[PDB]
Symmetry: D2
Subunit: 480 residues, 4 copies
């Protein structure tokens, strides 16, 4: 029997005679939930409520914003296993990874609670020259206003938290469009937020939306900021059609990793490479897709990495010992299977995996895949790693940069100069030193260059995009 859910319109749970949206268990394929789909009239009402709630949201005391965020943390801790279970069910990610995501969501909301009481301003001297005599300024940050949020399916909770927590920390009302394949996590946040008294009426709406209405989140003039996490072609098109609003984009990647040493040893290096290459089954924007190993270490790394790939448990994501769960859909798995077959046909040497079983794709390692192949050129978003050998470090860095993406990169080195050369020359938002590129701390500036997006997430950085600078220029203030 599918569980019937409510959606959130102007802080209130709504159902009515709205069309039902089926949410399936990504392992069994059974309809596990029925979710109301918002109408055009609902989206219009939600945006009007966000505009109407903006003054009350801006008038909240810093401690009130903190109170809201601290109540979210308490509720997430309380409902931990319930949330982790729902997360595995709608996303198909192993229960261990789902627990890791809830843990990181608690961290995100906690970082936001602490940041909400730390929005510092500046007192600036403005008498920089004789003409400017008797001038001083107070620079203060103010909420941008109503925020349009469009979240993904790969991290249905954490990637929602990275938008929702900064908005509340700043005092911005918001309208969130969760991914239609995974809206349950966002709706649990809606259930939590709905019960928080400090939060003004109309401050939030959480609405799964039809394809014919989805465009309102991009074009509506009442929103002051569009913040999107998802597909690059969709994101870039949204940026082009957004109108006057500010745009924040967290898009795909094709993350490389350089192995120039074993740090601290081979066992730990293999372990971090396995973690990166099969991070959420590769269904991550920072999944380690490309692996560059120095020729002197190549055979040892290839052997150990492939042997460890072969040991990974693929199956029921509800099982505690399951490392690799199914892909989001059978079509996603079919797409990955095609790109593996294509990579092999274009000259790639399959070392392990490459076979499909419904929505499951075996953890795959392909050696010497050319740039011509889609597996090398484009984001795979599956459990596939492309292995390459190098002789020159500067050339390895150049090859790491040989992509239209630019999210994160990884580097294993004991060399001081190699580490800082990589930091200087890698065309990414984050360089991971002595871990794979799939590492992210929820307080770090996270984002990319090139096709990977614009701006940074990470609580205090996302808060910056939701804030507007205002200066009070004071002429001879304090003169009697």
């Amino acid at each position: 029997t599918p569980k019937k859910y409510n959606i959130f319109l102007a802080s209130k749970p709504v159902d009515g005679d709205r069309k039902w949206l089926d949410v399936t268990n990504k392992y069994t394929n059974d309809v596990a939930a029925k979710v109301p789909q918002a109408t055009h009239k609902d989206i219009d009402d939600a945006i009007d409520a966000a505009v109407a709630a903006a003054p009350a949201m801006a008038a909240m005391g810093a401690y009130e914003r903190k109170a809201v965020l601290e109540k979210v943390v308490a509720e997430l801790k309380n409902r931990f296993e319930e949330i982790a279970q729902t997360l595995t069910m709608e996303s198909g990610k192993p229960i261990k990874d789902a627990r890791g995501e809830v843990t990181r969501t608690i961290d995100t909301f906690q970082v936001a609670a602490e940041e909400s009481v730390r929005i510092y301003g500046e007192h600036i001297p403005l008498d920089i020259s004789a003409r400017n005599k008797g001038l001083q300024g107070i620079v203060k940050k103010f909420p941008i206003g109503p925020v349009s949020m469009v979240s993904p399916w790969n991290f249905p909770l954490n990637l929602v938290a990275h938008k929702v927590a900064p908005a509340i920390a700043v005092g911005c009302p918001f309208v969130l469009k969760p991914a239609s394949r995974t809206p349950l996590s966002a709706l649990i946040l809606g259930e939590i937020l709905h019960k928080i008294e400090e939060l003004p009426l109309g401050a939030f709406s959480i609405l799964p939306v039809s394809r014919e209405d989805a465009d309102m989140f991009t074009v509506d003039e009442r929103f002051k900021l569009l913040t999107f996490t998802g597909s690059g072609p969709i994101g870039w098109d949204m940026k082009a059609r957004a109108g006057k609003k500010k745009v924040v984009m967290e898009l795909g990647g094709n993350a490389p990793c350089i192995v120039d040493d074993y740090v601290p040893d081979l066992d730990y290096t293999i372990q971090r490479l396995i973690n990166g290459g099969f991070y959420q089954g590769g269904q991550s924007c920072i999944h380690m897709q490309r692996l560059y190993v120095h020729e002197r270490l190549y055979d040892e790394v290839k052997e150990g990495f492939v042997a460890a790939v072969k040991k990974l448990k693929m199956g029921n994501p509800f099982e505690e010992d399951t490392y690799l769960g199914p892909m989001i859909s059978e079509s996603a798995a079919k797409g990955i299977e095609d790109w593996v077959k294509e990579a092999v046909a274009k000259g790639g040497k399959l070392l392990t995996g490459g076979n499909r079983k419904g929505a499951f794709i075996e953890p795959t390692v392909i050696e010497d895949v050319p740039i011509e192949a889609n597996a090398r050129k484009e984001e795979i978003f599956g459990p596939v790693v492309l292995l390459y050998k190098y002789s020159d470090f500067k050339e390895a860095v150049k090859e790491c940069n040989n992509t239209h993406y630019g999210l994160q990169s990884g580097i294993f080195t004991k060399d001081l100069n190699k580490a800082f050369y990589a930091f200087e020359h890698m065309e990414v938002g984050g360089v991971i030193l002595n871990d794979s590129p799939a590492l992210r701390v929820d307080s770090q500036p996270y984002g990319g260059l090139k096709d990977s997006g614009i701006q940074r997430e990470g609580v205090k950085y996302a808060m910056d995009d939701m804030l507007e600078t205002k200066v009070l220029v004071m002429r001879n203030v304090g003169t009697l």
Copy 2:
């Protein structure tokens, strides 16, 4: 009489050749004072390719090298001060006093940039915020965004160029600048100066006045990483929409209000400040004080003194030392202002002074009780026109200040501590001027707007932020042997 032939700058080099000429007129006499080569499509393509090719050398410059470039600009500006001011008055029509004020502010802009070039600080951040993150730390550092497309206006041909060029050099970003076709000489003088600086890599800069048929390259070209525009709102918003993947910075118009709730420190100084605001570059300013709200108790005294001071303002030859008000940029600009004045009056506005046109000249104008229906009240006038209104409630005056689709700057005259900070909190602008008109700008302050006034901030260190990209080095157990 004989127009001076200028060179344009292609990949750091002065060019002329078999190129079409652009006429630059003296805005007072209407004589062709200068002839400027117009860049071809191939020139713009070559300029952008050179900017891409110069990006690594720009990024590899030492902070002291970027400082030396900026300090050499300051030295050259000081050296050629009067020559630059005279060229500025000639191509823009702004009085010589205002043109000298602009050269002074440009020196300040380049000087603030020189000091900021050696102060691009990074952060050392702890990343072990929770047990799962044990042994993690980060180094957050800022890097140049890459090639920048610059599109500058005609109202401040030098300082509004400086506010884009100086941050780009301070950061180490190569650039291709499209100066306004009506006023490109100021930008070409900077080009002459930059061309002689050895520290600046080859291809680091291009200053190309371009025809309408090629102007779109500055918007759509994928090789540029940032588009920074100052000018007309409808043009700007359209450029933002068609820019593609690049980041966009916009400095657009305004409909700046001012509240007079007290005389600070006295009536004479208030009137004087209200005159500077209302007739800031003949109103041809994005922060020109267009709307004036005076408290009912002060109204008759302010109206009388302000109108009497407007009547004393010298309008004429901008080369004359005592000229306060020069001509508008064109006769069509003046005709447009004249129409909006006539329309404001027809819709119920009471003309207090001025309103008449003489070619490109518009008399300093004050109109009382102009309704929202009139274009003079709804839209940016960009002329020497001030709309006077009376208020009885302060909260209502703040609400009326906010009653616009613009949000650049606002002014407030008050002796009241709470009124001052209420205005700072509730005025929907980028900058609240306390005890001065909204026309005040310090070249180091964060400058920009909300609503249709634009996106992001200029002011050297703030413009540098938009030309920088954040990168974090996440370090796992670094320092463990």
Copy 3:
């Protein structure tokens, strides 16, 4: 009425043994409520050796571990709230309402510290400021100073301990705390809390009530890297003189003035805040409002309302919920205040209300026109006494506020924007309280003074600065292969 036997903390462990007992009395009844072991010279020597030995493990803690310690303190303070508040009234004599307010502020102090422990940011600095410095960059990071010597007061036995202990744990500094001998129980409650926290290394803390013959170790011992003292000025200044090589932080007395130039927002709220400041913890506060300057136009109205409100203040048993004013710390403290009141009156002061003593109790007192010659005006009274004065000129009132050898905090009630910022600019203090009495303190604000009021600032992030040392890694051509 059996006294409760307490343990002291030596190298993180509860100790008792055959140590001399110190009596801790209930400041209302005068009964011995607690018996506390007094540390020997060998105990202090062992405590300091353990702090030196624990310094590397303290410095090696993850930021999240220091956070966990502080968060566990917050949880325990919340859990034992009423028990702690009751112990506080008992040993200090402050009303239970004020004791509960102190426990709340202590939870705030420890909470701010927990959040600050994960926010110790460093700097990435360019060092190529000139040609000679080519290829240089730096990483500036902050490190724990090392073992800290803490000497805490009796007026805030818990919160003024928290303002030293919480920053030390947030940074990762081991410490040896000497609590006030009249009020050590609050510090020993923190000790039993810390003793149960596993994350905190062995020897990280010691809390030792000491004899007069050994008290000097906290000043002179070379093993301590920082001395942080809150208390009496003559004692503090003498400790600074004899401290040796270590850094010194001093939070000393005050003679806090307040200017009433307007009623903000109204008279009722102004009187309420003036009563709060003037009788803050019975005046036993380093920010107690001792001097009140009222404008001549407001004088009679303020005097009448303030004196009428003083007359309504409930003085008695501090355990009673409706008690506003409790007894002084000792009968000699009350006798001292009584003498200074009699002396102020003898030298020309006009007693408006109070001035009488009943054992350790002093009636809330208001004295008008007390000359500078009198001790009540010249020195810190540390009692429920307010000296009322009239002024005609605001600049003169600010000058009179500054006419003291103290300089902790000052208050100002004004609706005038310029008066507020004139006071901020010219008041010779660490904190200017705008539209509240000088007795206001937020546990995150920079708190401290000028002149005889001390050196440096407390307030979590500011106190953390004094417990940190700057280290730069100067890097030559790092990243060159």
Copy 4:
């Protein structure tokens, strides 16, 4: 032949009169090259009174006025460059190449100060951190500490004066400078420059060479708010102990080590930097590389190359362009170094080169395996002496670097990422130099030490911090109408 008579600066004015003459000798020839008037007790009293009286005008200067003063100093230093460099070599005995390097660094110091003078940022802080603190916000602003006492050294007569004088002017602090009696001309040259600057208020500065009988006023006078000293540790620590209530900043000696674990980028560059460190100002530097720890695998190659490079160093007339090593400050200084070399060799040290004295000259010396028992190893030599040691374990080398009572700076040569950050974490110093000797200092970096090396940091923006006092304006419901 005839000594040049100089003026001293009393309350901004050049004074001479009937004052006693202080002889300043040419440190190479020993001839009296200059005669300076020595200030009397009354002069010092007048200077301090003028500094107190000038403090309000100093604090009221616009940021641009403080900048103009500093920019005028930079212009004058550039103008008188060779004259200043020659005067420096003459009074200090340092080679002309090093004296020119010092004048360059002084221009950098004053230039960094000019830029910092217009960047004294304050904070806007939310204070509503909890419900009890509702409606509270703060403005944190920094104010000049007041009159400063400056006591400068003889090893850098100009730059180490600049590192006190430039921050004081950048902040707006009046000062009284006691230059070293052996080298006061550099300080007096600054006084001449400063005396002609109109922007600087009357009484803002005094540069007074003072007799031993009057020198104590700089330590004990209550009118000074800060004592900043650079010199001998035992003198400095004694000044800190007797300073009274004022804040104290100390830049004292060192015993700087260097670890050679790799050649970075090569052996030739490594030797060159080691030579620079070991013989930096003839070792008469607080950051002179006194101890060299080389890995056993590199030892014989480093020893051979370093000793061969030492043998090539030109010692002689400091006015000669090719002179690397000049004489010591006095013959007694050289005799002291000679004794410690003889003592080191008697206690088991193996002399590899030098060790001989010729008047005030000490040959560049390298001694192998000197024990901790010897004064050369335990104490600051402050001469051209390097102690060479071999190590097998890196962690042990870091521990041996820390095996000193000083802690100013350390150096490390490494290609290892973890070794570099282990050294940054565990070296007990204020600065770790990576892939250069410890003798490296950028005039903008935080410079200072731990242990006996002093308290606080110099480096313009850091020294400015010590000359500033924090003030918070706590605002209750400001902006509520």
